[PDB]
From a paper:
The extracellular domain (residues 58–796) was expressed as a secreted protein from insect cells, purified and crystallized in space group P212121 with two molecules in the asymmetric unit. The overall structure of DPP10 is very similar to those of DPP6 and DPP4, with Cα-root-mean-square-deviations (r.m.s.d.) of 1.1 Å (for 646 superimposed atoms) and 1.5 Å (for 578 atoms), respectively. Each subunit consists of two domains: an open (no “Velcro” architecture present) β-propeller (residues 82–517, shown in yellow in Fig. 1) consisting of eight blades each built up by four antiparallel β-strands and a classical α/β-hydrolase fold (residues 517–679 and 707–796; shown in red). Additionally, a small-extended arm formed by three helices is inserted between two β-strands of the hydrolase domain (residues 679–707; shown in blue). In our structure, all these asparagine residues with the exception of Asn-90 were found to be glycosylated and well-defined electron densities were observed for the first sugar residues. Similarly to DPP6, DPP10 has three disulfide bonds in the β-propeller (Cys349-Cys356, Cys465-Cys468, Cys475-Cys493) and one in the α/β-hydrolase domain (Cys670-Cys780). DPP10 contains the glutamate residues (Glu-233 and Glu-234), but the serine is replaced by a glycine and the tryptophan residue preceding the serine is replaced by a lysine (changing the sequence to GKGYGG). In DPP10, the entrance is narrowed by the presence of Lys-77, Lys-126 and Glu-763 (channel colored in red). According to a PISA analysis the two DPP10 molecules in the asymmetric unit of the crystal form a symmetric dimer with a total buried surface area of 7300 Å2. The main dimerization interface, which has a two-fold symmetry, between the two chains (1580 Å2 per chain) is formed primarily by residues Pro-262 to Gly-277 and Tyr-282 to Gln-287 of the β-propeller domain, as well as by residues Phe-732 to Ala-745 and Thr-750 to Pro-755 located in the hydrolase domain.
In this paper, we present the crystal structure of human DPP10, a naturally inactive member of the prolyl oligopeptidase family that belongs to the S9B serine protease subfamily. DPP6 and DPP10 are homologous glycosylated, single-pass type II transmembrane proteins that lack the crucial serine residue of the catalytic triad; instead, DPP6 contains an aspartic acid (Asp712) and DPP10 a glycine (Gly651). The Ca2+ binding proteins (KChIPS) and the dipeptidylpeptidase-like proteins (DPPLs) DPP6 (also known as DPPX) and DPP10 (also known as DPPY) associate with the α-subunits of the Kv4 subfamily to form a ternary complex of approximately 750 kDa containing 12 protein molecules (4 copies of each protein per channel). DPP10 and DPP6 both accelerate the activation and inactivation of Kv4.3 channel gating but with distinct biophysical properties.
Residue numbers in the entry:
A (entry chain B): 65 to 783
B (entry chain A): 66 to 782
Amino acid sequence: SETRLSLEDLFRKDFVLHDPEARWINDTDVVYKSENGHVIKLNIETNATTLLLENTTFVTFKASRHSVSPDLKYVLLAYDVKQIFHYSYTASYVIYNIHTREVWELNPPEVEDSVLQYAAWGVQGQQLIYIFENNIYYQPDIKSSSLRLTSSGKEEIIFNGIADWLYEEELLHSHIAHWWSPDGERLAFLMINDSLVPTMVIPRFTGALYPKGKQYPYPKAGQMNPTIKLYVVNLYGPTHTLELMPPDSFKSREYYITMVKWVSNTKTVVRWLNRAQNISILTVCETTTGACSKKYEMTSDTWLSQQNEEPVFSRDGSKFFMTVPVKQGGRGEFHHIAMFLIQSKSEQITVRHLTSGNWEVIKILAYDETTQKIYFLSTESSPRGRQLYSASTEGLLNRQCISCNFMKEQCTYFDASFSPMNQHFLLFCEGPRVPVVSLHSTDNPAKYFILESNSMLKEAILKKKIGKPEIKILHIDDYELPLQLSLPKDFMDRNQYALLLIMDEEPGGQLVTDKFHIDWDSVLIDMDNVIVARFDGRGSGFQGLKILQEIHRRLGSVEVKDQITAVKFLLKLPYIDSKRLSIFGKGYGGYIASMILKSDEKLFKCGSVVAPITDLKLYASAFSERYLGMPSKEESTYQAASVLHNVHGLKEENILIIHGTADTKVHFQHSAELIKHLIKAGVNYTMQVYPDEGHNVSEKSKYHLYSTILKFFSDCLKE
Amino acid sequence: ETRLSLEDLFRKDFVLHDPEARWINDTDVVYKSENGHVIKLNIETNATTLLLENTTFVTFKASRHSVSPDLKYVLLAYDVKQIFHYSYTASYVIYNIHTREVWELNPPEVEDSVLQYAAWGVQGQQLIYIFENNIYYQPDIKSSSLRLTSSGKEEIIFNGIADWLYEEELLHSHIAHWWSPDGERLAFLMINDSLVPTMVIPRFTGALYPKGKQYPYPKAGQMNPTIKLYVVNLYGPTHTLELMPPDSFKSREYYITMVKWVSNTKTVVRWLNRAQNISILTVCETTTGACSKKYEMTSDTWLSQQNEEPVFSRDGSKFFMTVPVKQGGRGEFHHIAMFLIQSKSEQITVRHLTSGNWEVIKILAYDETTQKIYFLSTESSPRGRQLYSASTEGLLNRQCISCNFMKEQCTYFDASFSPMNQHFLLFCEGPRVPVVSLHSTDNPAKYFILESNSMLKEAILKKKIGKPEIKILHIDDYELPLQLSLPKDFMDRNQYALLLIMDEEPGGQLVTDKFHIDWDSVLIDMDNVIVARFDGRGSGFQGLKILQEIHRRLGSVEVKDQITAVKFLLKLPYIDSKRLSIFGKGYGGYIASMILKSDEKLFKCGSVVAPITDLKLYASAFSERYLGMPSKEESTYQAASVLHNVHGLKEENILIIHGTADTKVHFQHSAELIKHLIKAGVNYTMQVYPDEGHNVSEKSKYHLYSTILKFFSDCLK
Ligand SMILES: *[C@@H]1O[C@H](CO)[C@@H](O[C@@H]2O[C@H](CO)[C@@H](O[C@@H]3O[C@H](CO)[C@@H](O)[C@H](O[C@H]4O[C@H](CO)[C@@H](O)[C@H](O)[C@@H]4O)[C@@H]3O)[C@H](O)[C@H]2NC(C)=O)[C@H](O)[C@H]1NC(C)=O
Ligand SMILES: *[C@@H]1O[C@H](CO)[C@@H](O[C@@H]2O[C@H](CO)[C@@H](O[C@@H]3O[C@H](CO)[C@@H](O)[C@H](O)[C@@H]3O)[C@H](O)[C@H]2NC(C)=O)[C@H](O)[C@H]1NC(C)=O
Ligand SMILES: *[C@@H]1O[C@H](CO)[C@@H](O[C@@H]2O[C@H](CO)[C@@H](O)[C@H](O)[C@H]2NC(C)=O)[C@H](O)[C@H]1NC(C)=O
Ligand SMILES: *[C@@H]1O[C@H](CO)[C@@H](O[C@@H]2O[C@H](CO)[C@@H](O)[C@H](O)[C@H]2NC(C)=O)[C@H](O)[C@H]1NC(C)=O
Ligand SMILES: *[C@@H]1O[C@H](CO)[C@@H](O[C@@H]2O[C@H](CO)[C@@H](O)[C@H](O)[C@H]2NC(C)=O)[C@H](O)[C@H]1NC(C)=O
Ligand SMILES: *[C@@H]1O[C@H](CO)[C@@H](O)[C@H](O)[C@H]1NC(C)=O
Ligand SMILES: *[C@@H]1O[C@H](CO)[C@@H](O)[C@H](O)[C@H]1NC(C)=O
Ligand SMILES: *[C@@H]1O[C@H](CO)[C@@H](O)[C@H](O)[C@H]1NC(C)=O
Ligand SMILES: *[C@@H]1O[C@H](CO)[C@@H](O)[C@H](O)[C@H]1NC(C)=O
């Protein structure tokens, strides 16, 4: 009874899921690192294991990032890692020679003790590239000097191979704007032109004598957007670079490139998207020429579905598999696998649907061409989980679940990765149990062995109370939505508990999920006897498009009304205390958390909001415009979704606004603007701001934040 | 209902009504603002004219008014935007006193403009205005303007207006130009910030993409503004002559801490070395540029009040100035000096006209037609200020004027004499709710009263509003006041909470007869908290000896005193050691912080606004004055900081309030503090106001007071 979960535990190194950082190399050798922190080669044939790196990635300035060369003769360490946006990190690199020790500084020519925007490795051999001053550099091997592939790079204006903010956070959802041809002969990359894009300033108060902060291109709602070209260079000899032109329909009009991928060692598929995000064009490009052939096109009456989807091919290209929406009847559309048959030049490709039901095919993992099978992740088995399924491409059109019996009750939510010949696959658990990675043979899920058990962490949460989350199911409109109630160790049916209602932090995400998670609220629960509640309302993703697009043009309108009807039901329970009800949400969820805190009725005694996005006119183009469309251009519906005007009350409501000053996603401006109206409106509120922090606070401050929130919620909830 | 509540202080009943009195002739005084009306008064006939009416509303809430010399026009400032402290930037309009019609005041080619400065001249209707750091001149309402300087460059080269360092630290006002008595000539400062490092004031609250400014702000030991003093003639050619520095200062770092006209040609410019230990009074013939060394000063610590303005013979045979005199043990005090000017470089016999342990604060006037000179002095009492006259040529006698005005109701004064000195304005400011009055010189018949602050008087009358017991403490060889402001109903029995308020800038005086009403008065009345002020060493206006006890030990001394004062406070029966709180802002936030460390924890909670937390991060001319140069000559700078060795603030409940746009104490100070405070794991609470200054706007304001009030009241329970 004195073995329960305290905040500083979450920072204990016992917890903190240990990720195997598994990676394929041959169809034999998997490079998964990090059991004890050791990088390891494993031959799945012989079981033979080699120690590549040891507890060394300490010794060189706390190297936080590791990558093993293709030829397995070297390791690339990143140390001095500095955050930038989300996936963007800028650090210094070093090269450990796997066979003998000796480490090199990785520097651009003429430059010493340097800092790089990106490093990684290539595909063939020991080749690697690194980005510096927004220019791409290439080293054919450890031997040779580097080769600057682009001179066009200009700091904070023209980017090469790395994403500017808009492309990283919104469009691409990763900072890697370049891609390697399968044979390492060729490199495709994005040239992003921010010349005309308006810039926002991230201030720095904490530096030297006179601190100076940066200014980056950040197009706001309806603003000038980054123009962008897609080039391709050949890494052998001449380095002739060819721009791959857009589809003729998009030529001259505003557009984004939301994906590109290699199919052959020459052809690539670049998905183009209009600024409005209602029109998709899949193009296939011959890189030796620049021949660009319209292949498939899509449209929406609201906004286009997952834009990063990557199609699988015949490796010749006779056929290819992709996921698209199918009307499915009433109950809306669901993403299902498509059979498109590419031919004969000859536009037109026959489409055959390989899947259907009310559930989604999330990702298409692999196509095993030697047989009749294709592999994917699906909610079929259950909307709350994810499972690994195979269907037979050519054939009966049948379907079968693989992951279903792995843990039974202990793994309901998966992800997986197949070897390059698809002969076997890695199965990440992430399920209700403390996550476990495992390596199976394809044709025979004998489960073989287990790569990572997260052992220490398992026994850690075992000791602690750690209850089971009752799940109620609500009917809103025509839908059925999950309400997850996480309840204190000892639960009297009798008493009146305090209720924390946590918001989904970005739209189209899924709160209630079998995915294992441990975090602050778990502490709020156990100590402090608070029940935390999550409810996935309309707009929450991963069930149908119909729930997902219920948000279009009404933002904060719908999600809020649902969150409230969910509190309503919550309210009619005996064991929750209407007197003490609190809300929490961050980012966008801070936005909705705020909308909920206005005049409808006051169901909340106190609530706390972190990096709240408070006015959509002030948020990023590709985000606002997606849901609300263009601003003063076509719509004043933008005035409607704001926290800023009409603050008309937050009454006895106790409000806590937490914001990072250096935040690059939700600018501090959002809370500044809010706080301003909040004063002129005469509303009781309390704020905590972290000088020079981001949307995600550093390790230093973070604990302080949790402590803050924890104290806040626990204290206000007291009777 | 009959005690003082916060929102009263914002009630327009309160808010001292300032007459904004101003002389014109030796007859007509222009004091405005009784009902908000601008008024001419003929002190001969009593005749009053209404110049302006309840119109300075109608034109966009005009916040600022000035009447032309010839009394035919009024200059309104509206759209007033704060800049630093005295610096305001607004749009101007010209009301024609005789016939209403109003003009836009614009630089040529510019429409609906915004100006850095306007005011008026001396002779006639002439006026000048500053735009893009250039000086413009209008000989009259008729004529087009005349650009007197093209050298102006935004936030780099300033003309006639002070950059931050000169406004806040050196000059203590933003007016860098001065008019010759006859309006023939204009002297002004050219401030060159080219090489001075710049600090950024961020703006989060603006339009789509807010952009904040960046101004030259030399920090401790940094590059400083270079500056020249030119003079232009406002008639014809506009030949402009630079007035060269003293030869000794030539080529070395220096400030100009004052300039004033003496004749319609000669000026006295006081020069100061960067170190602030050497003064040179120079007198300059403007038609030539002849610059003659007159008097020089030195200190072993730092030079005394630098804005002192000397009075002359109007010929220049003699002149009066205030300087320190050794006075014996007990230190030095500023007393009036008789310097006799006669031919060439230096000499000039010095005769001291005053002495004792007390100071001559300001020398107001010299009546040349008789044997008298006029000044303000602490003679009558260190806590007050009185208006004294001494006989220059003669017995060397002294007599107090203000002594019997209010007896017990006015002990603290200031005054202004008419141009011929024939009669004077006496501002009360004393213990009673301030009252301005107009007296005849040779006969203080008190004549009449200009401003009674009537409504305000009856306002505080109704409310409880107690009397401040004053204890006197012995520290070292000195005797220092401790003012205890006590709740309406005071039991000798109970244990009260104690708020200890800090003096906000060094060399100021907390305990003073000067009337004041503010938040703490509310803290007192409602919430039964006793607020305490104690003027320790370094506090000004008694001797230099108390004042300079700070040199090179900053936060060292003031703190030890503030504590020994808490000690004594602690031994009282009726104060509760359990509940003790501290408050201080700006610099006082600095000391408030030093007190909150390790010595012992005598405080349960304390609150700090725009704390200056590291002197290396404060302004050059401030830090360097007390602590001298930085890594240049001293690491004693490491000593005075809050930043390292936050070693504890224990159960201490701390509230840090800071404006984001603050241009005096940068937000950096609290950012820096807050940083260490987290890595040190200390419990603290913060409230920051986006886009506010060192002085919060009206909007936020109230919210701040509420905060502080709640904080202090709640923690003390
Ligand atoms: C405010 O102060 C600044 C700094 O003192 C001042 O800028 C400088 O002004 C002087 C004016 O003469 C310049 O001095 C030189 O004049 C002759 C031209 O005949 C040249 O020989 C010089 O060549 C170089 O001198 C410097 C040597 O390092 C260089 O830094 C400089 O950029 C020249 O290349 C030079 O022209 C001087 O150039 C500037 N720059 C600086 C930083 O001193 C400015 O004029 C002042 N504003 C006013 C009106 O007071
Ligand atoms: C990214 O976009 C910027 C937008 O500013 C591009 O800058 C553009 O550069 C071109 C040529 O450098 C400019 O054209 C001009 O034409 C005249 C006539 O010959 C010539 O005198 C100028 O020197 C210049 O060449 C153009 O005005 C300018 N602006 C625009 C709107 O494009 C930049 O080229 C782009 N970068 C890349 C590599 O895509
Ligand atoms: C470096 O890795 C080795 C194993 O490769 C670790 O050595 C173990 O240390 C633990 C202490 O936690 C001992 O209980 C074991 O006996 C050691 N060996 C084995 C086989 O586990 C070592 O912990 C690693 N260094 C760290 C912690 O960074
Ligand atoms: C995709 O959405 C955009 C919204 O930006 C549509 O934009 C058109 O813009 C004009 C501008 O005046 C409007 O008059 C039209 O009504 C809009 N068309 C609509 C509503 O669709 C764009 O046409 C859309 N296209 C598709 C394929 O849906
Ligand atoms: C005024 O004080 C400053 C220092 O506060 C003196 O500056 C001198 O600076 C040099 C720099 O290396 C030192 O070596 C000297 O010790 C300083 N002189 C001293 C002791 O004062 C400056 O000389 C002082 N001048 C006067 C007139 O007192
Ligand atoms: C290698 O190790 C694993 C560990 O359980 C085992 O399952 C596997 O059978 C071994 N190798 C073989 C026989 O394939
Ligand atoms: C704000 O809070 C303070 C104290 O909690 C309270 O005195 C005041 O009534 C509140 N203001 C309003 C109008 O709610
Ligand atoms: C205008 O003055 C009159 C009397 O002179 C007064 O009653 C009135 O209050 C004044 N102005 C305003 C702001 O009402
Ligand atoms: C004007 O009135 C004042 C106020 O009572 C009085 O002192 C003065 O003698 C009067 N002067 C004349 C000349 O009317």
